[PDB]
Amino acid sequence: RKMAFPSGKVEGCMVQVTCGTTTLNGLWLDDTVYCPRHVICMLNPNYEDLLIRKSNHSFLVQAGNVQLRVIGHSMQNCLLRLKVDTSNPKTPKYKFVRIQPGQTFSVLACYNGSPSGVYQCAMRPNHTIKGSFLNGSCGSVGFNIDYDCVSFCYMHHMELPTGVHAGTDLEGKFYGPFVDRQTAQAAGTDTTITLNVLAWLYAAVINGDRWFLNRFTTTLNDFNLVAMKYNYEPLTQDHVDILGPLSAQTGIAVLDMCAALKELLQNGMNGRTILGSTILEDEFTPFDVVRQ
């Protein structure tokens, strides 16, 4: 099952940022509030021009009942760093990280500064996420929690015409070739996260369906050559080592699981299922499998 991290430490940081009539979500850490810079906008806007035309007083920042006053502002990439007169008493230990494709994080969906729901998603190889984001969701945040430290890694900005979502890290650099404009943008073709599909296949073996296994063998090179022809990410030697624990628990060598996957890619499943589905799941990490 897809589990999310507990959202509490992040709920205390969610605020509402309003400019004129356009409102979105912001992240209040210490005396600074972060939010997508498009709060000040629509096609091909000059963001420097519009920021210099804006006064601190223009930004309405509400944190629950309280109103916070912008004591200053600056732009970092596609984000705005509003300085506020109050430090957030509920700020957690935190860091900004750049999540990598294949990896997962939890999204705390927010509307009007109120956290609505938390779900877990992965960053795809084409630098989009298959999220659930309605109008009002910009500035909602993705994050991982290790110990008591929160790793902020995603701020929501856009939904591509194809249903998927695009955003930035906490420094405002967009993941992927997207720009914050009211234009239709296309992601690159979405390749499948091989490392996670193998983790799934290992998970299926621990659950007791082995029907897709075989005695054929493969080298890493030859598996990667097949995989790319089916739009699957090549498997690095690093990924092989990551699968080590799942390999020893099941007694099935990683290259033999790849030989299995190679046969699934080339012949499909004759309507057969793994863990109940006809399609191979690719947002369960090896860590997720090991933990559960």
Ligand X SMILES: *[C@@](O)(CO)[C@H](C[C@@H]1CCNC1=O)NC(=O)[C@H](CC(C)C)NC(=O)c1cc2c(OC)cccc2[nH]1
Q: Which of 56, 87, 214, 273 binds a second copy (CB under 8 A)?
A: 273
Tell me: does residue 277 bind a second copy (CB under 8 A).
yes
Phi then psi for 57, rounded to 5 degrees? -60, -20
Neighbours of 48 (CB within 10 A): 9
Active site residue 138: yes
Q: How far is CA 161 from CA 158, 164, 182, 183, in A?
A: 10, 8, 11, 9
CA proximity to 26, closest of 120, 106, 126, 139 = 139
Q: Which of 56, 67, 183, 273 binds ligand X (CB under 6 A)?
A: 183
Closest approach of ligand X to the CB of residue 159, in Å: 3
Tell me: does residue 12 bind a second copy (CB under 8 A).
yes
Tell me: does residue 136 bind ligand X (CB under 6 A).
yes
Which residue number has the CB closest to ligand X?
Answer: 138
Position 3: which residue type? M
Tell me: does residue 182 bind ligand X (CB under 6 A).
yes
Tell me: does residue 112 bind a second copy (CB under 8 A).
no
Q: Which of 78, 121, 138, 258 is catalytic?
A: 138
- Per-residue burial over 176-198, b if 16 or more Cβ lie within 10 Å, else e, is bebebeeeebebeebbbbbbbbb
Tell me: does residue 197 bind ligand X (CB under 6 A).
no
Tell me: does residue 177 bind a second copy (CB under 8 A).
no
Tell me: does residue 133 bind ligand X (CB under 6 A).
yes
Q: Which does 132 bind (CB under 5 to 8 A by kind): a second copy, ligand X, none?
A: a second copy
Tell me: does residue 217 bind a second copy (CB under 8 A).
no
Beta bridge partners of 81: 34
d(CA 12, CA 57): 24
Q: Which does 162 bind (CB under 5 to 8 A by kind): a second copy, ligand X, none?
A: none
CA proximity to 57, closest of 22, 110, 20, 88 = 20
For binding to ligand X (CB under 6 A), which residues are involved? Answer: 24, 36, 38, 133-138, 157-159, 161, 165, 180-184
Tell me which residues are annotated as active site: 38, 138
